[PDB]
Design an enzyme around this catalytic site. Sequence first.
Site, mmCIF file in Angstrom:
data_model
loop_
_atom_site.group_PDB
_atom_site.id
_atom_site.type_symbol
_atom_site.label_atom_id
_atom_site.label_comp_id
_atom_site.label_asym_id
_atom_site.label_seq_id
_atom_site.Cartn_x
_atom_site.Cartn_y
_atom_site.Cartn_z
ATOM 1 N N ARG A 10 1.040 -1.349 -0.011
ATOM 2 C CA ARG A 10 -0.285 -0.136 0.678
ATOM 3 C C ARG A 10 0.921 1.169 0.130
ATOM 4 N NH1 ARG A 10 -1.271 2.939 4.500
ATOM 5 N NH2 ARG A 10 -0.604 1.953 6.660
ATOM 6 N N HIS A 12 4.008 1.853 -0.854
ATOM 7 C CA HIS A 12 4.952 1.621 -1.916
ATOM 8 C C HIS A 12 5.691 1.298 -3.204
ATOM 9 C CE1 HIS A 12 7.235 3.098 1.299
ATOM 10 N NE2 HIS A 12 7.257 2.117 1.871
ATOM 11 N N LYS A 39 2.927 12.231 5.970
ATOM 12 C CA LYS A 39 4.426 11.688 5.793
ATOM 13 C C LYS A 39 5.454 12.200 5.163
ATOM 14 C CE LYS A 39 6.417 7.166 5.433
ATOM 15 N NZ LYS A 39 6.011 5.757 4.706
ATOM 16 N N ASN A 42 8.158 9.501 0.731
ATOM 17 C CA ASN A 42 7.806 8.304 0.920
ATOM 18 C C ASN A 42 7.730 8.609 -0.813
ATOM 19 O OD1 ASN A 42 6.434 6.373 1.823
ATOM 20 N ND2 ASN A 42 5.283 6.183 -0.151
ATOM 21 N N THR A 43 7.910 7.067 -1.239
ATOM 22 C CA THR A 43 8.821 6.441 -2.508
ATOM 23 C C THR A 43 7.724 4.969 -3.469
ATOM 24 O OG1 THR A 43 10.652 7.001 -2.179
ATOM 25 C CG2 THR A 43 10.745 5.387 -3.956
ATOM 26 N N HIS A 117 9.640 -2.728 4.356
ATOM 27 C CA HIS A 117 9.781 -1.194 4.456
ATOM 28 C C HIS A 117 10.716 -0.971 3.107
ATOM 29 C CE1 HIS A 117 9.430 -1.298 8.857
ATOM 30 N NE2 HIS A 117 9.236 -2.204 9.156
ATOM 31 N N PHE A 118 10.656 -0.058 2.825
ATOM 32 C CA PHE A 118 11.692 0.241 1.753
ATOM 33 C C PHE A 118 12.387 1.726 2.230
ATOM 34 C CE2 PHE A 118 12.178 1.771 -2.514
ATOM 35 C CZ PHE A 118 12.616 2.885 -1.943
ATOM 36 N N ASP A 119 13.705 1.053 2.570
ATOM 37 C CA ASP A 119 14.905 1.832 3.326
ATOM 38 C C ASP A 119 15.687 2.692 2.772
ATOM 39 O OD1 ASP A 119 16.735 1.037 5.718
ATOM 40 O OD2 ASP A 119 17.943 1.047 4.764
#
Length: 122
Positions: A10, A12, A39, A42-43, A117-119
């Site tokens: 959702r 990313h 936020k 965000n990517t 998670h998108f780091d």
Amino acid sequence: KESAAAKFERQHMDSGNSPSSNYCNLMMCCRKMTQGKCKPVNTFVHESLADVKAVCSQKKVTCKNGQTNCYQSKSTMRITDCRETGSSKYPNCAYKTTQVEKHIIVACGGKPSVPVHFDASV
């Protein structure tokens, strides 16, 4: 509760075609990242779920937060960087959309190991 894998999809994933300037403003809201507060950054990844999930089988790297379940994509991917603009003040969450092509680093968790998670992007 929403699973981490679902939460990652959702927040990313947006497989398909890269975004106009209004992209981030609709996606940050549609995908629920503007509730309670905005936020900051965000990517969204525009490559396929498979290409993104496969990243959990690639180069291991330490997360920016010190954790060690991060993987770096072998290839670059079409992504959109969403950043809050200075004029943005919740509830007026405004975003700056930026399309880039970079390797992505995602944290992988669960059984089976999928993105949670998108780091970062590099």
